[PDB]
Amino acid sequence: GVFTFEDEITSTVPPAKLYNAMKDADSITPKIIDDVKSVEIVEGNGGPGTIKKLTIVEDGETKFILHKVESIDEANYAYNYSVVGGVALPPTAEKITFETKLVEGPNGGSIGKLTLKYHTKGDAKPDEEELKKGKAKGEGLFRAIEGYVLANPTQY
Amino acid sequence: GVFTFEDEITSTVPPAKLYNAMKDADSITPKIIDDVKSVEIVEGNGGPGTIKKLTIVEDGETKFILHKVESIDEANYAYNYSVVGGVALPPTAEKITFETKLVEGPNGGSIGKLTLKYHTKGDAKPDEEELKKGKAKGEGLFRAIEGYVLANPTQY
Ligand SMILES: O=S(=O)(O)c1cccc2cccc(Nc3ccccc3)c12
Ligand SMILES: O=S(=O)(O)c1cccc2cccc(Nc3ccccc3)c12
Ligand code: NA
Numbered sequence: 404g405v406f407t408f409e410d411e412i413t414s415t416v417p418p419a420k421l422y423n424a425m426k427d428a429d430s431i432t433p434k435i436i437d438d439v440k441s442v443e444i445v446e447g448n449g450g451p452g453t454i455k456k457l458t459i460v461e462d463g464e465t466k467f468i469l470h471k472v473e474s475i476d477e478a479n480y481a482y483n484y485s486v487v488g489g490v491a492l493p494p495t496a497e498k499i500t501f502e503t504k505l506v507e508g509p510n511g512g513s514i515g516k517l518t519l520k521y522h523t524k525g526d527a528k529p530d531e532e533e534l535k536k537g538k539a540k541g542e543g544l545f546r547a548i549e550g551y552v553l554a555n556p557t558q559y
Numbered sequence: 560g561v562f563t564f565e566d567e568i569t570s571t572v573p574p575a576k577l578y579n580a581m582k583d584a585d586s587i588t589p590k591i592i593d594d595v596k597s598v599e600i601v602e603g604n605g606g607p608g609t610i611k612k613l614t615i616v617e618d619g620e621t622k623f624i625l626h627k628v629e630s631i632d633e634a635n636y637a638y639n640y641s642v643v644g645g646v647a648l649p650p651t652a653e654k655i656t657f658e659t660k661l662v663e664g665p666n667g668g669s670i671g672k673l674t675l676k677y678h679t680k681g682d683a684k685p686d687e688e689e690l691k692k693g694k695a696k697g698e699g700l701f702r703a704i705e706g707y708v709l710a711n712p713t714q715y
């Protein structure tokens with residue numbers, strides 16, 4: 404099944420900057436997120452369809468995660484990617500899609516919509532703790548990008 | 560002369576957690592700020608009076624900022640440091656101090672109480688543009704430390 408969850412967020416950063424920075428995620432992520440060590444393109448040019456291998460550490464152990472870039476829609480400052488392999492897909496999970504869409508906020512910032520689509524195998528539902536973890540990672544990635552823009556204002 | 564300015568910024572991060580990040584600047588600053596590559600203690604043991612060097616590489620050229628730790632008060636979630644030399648000190652400034660102390664805020668978050676203390680040479684008043692930069696830097700770094708914490712939720 405597919406189970407969809409939407410959360411509304413804010414940023415003091417304007418949306419075109421966050422959008423441009425979201426596209427440098429491969430460079431930003433290992434800098435800001437301690438446990439992300441590398442991001443390598445397996446296939447593709449960085450746009451939709453691109454497969455990426457992420458090397459992370461969990462408890463001193465190296466683990467590998469696979470991401471796919473799904474779609475980008477610059478018109479709506481929208482960037483979608485999915486987790487397609489590794490530890491975040493327990494046996495009853497097929498894939499998890501993380502969508503981000505941004506609009507201008509009331510004071511030079513942004514209003515964001517973070518959508519999590521949790522794809523299960525057959526009849527299964529998302530485990531509640533797995534959904535919690537997934538939402539945390541998706542928002543954490545958004546906050547890594549935002550934090551990088553806040554710390555490096557001349558770059559966007 | 561000395562000229563001082565207060566502001567308050569809210570954070571969703573609870574103060575003990577946010578404070579732990581404030582005290583870990585030597586590790587965090589090179590992670591968040593692209594051009595800051597390392598922090599070296601020049602004199603002292605890390606507490607008040609410690610002099611630190613932030614090593615920067617900007618467009619290929621090595622530079623530094625010098626910091627002095629002014630006060631650390633864990634009980635009241637306070638971490639104060641000064642820029643005392645190098646590229647972050649304008650030629651018209653003697654010293655610029657960035658004070659941060661946290662109090663409990665709404666929803667188990669924090670309010671960061673920021674003070675900028677701008678020390679001029681002799682009888683001059685602060686350069687208005689440098690005051691602007693100093694205020695923006697103080698807020699921007701608070702928001703970026705916060706962002707690092709929100710991007711790394713396990714580390715806390
Ligand atoms: O967990 S995942 O579902 O792949 C995941 C989901 C959504 C966004 C992610 C961004 C970076 C790294 C991931 N993996 C990761 C794993 C461990 C530590 C830090 C990051 C992300
Ligand atoms: O370029 S600055 O003028 O400082 C600057 C000005 C205004 C806002 C800033 C926000 C984050 C980082 C900066 N720079 C920074 C540079 C080195 C160390 C720490 C902060 C900001
Ligand atoms: Na790193």
Ligand code: NA
Nearest residue numbers: 433436437439
């Ligand atoms: Na890292």
Ligand code: NA
Nearest residue numbers: 589592593595
């Ligand atoms: Na750096």
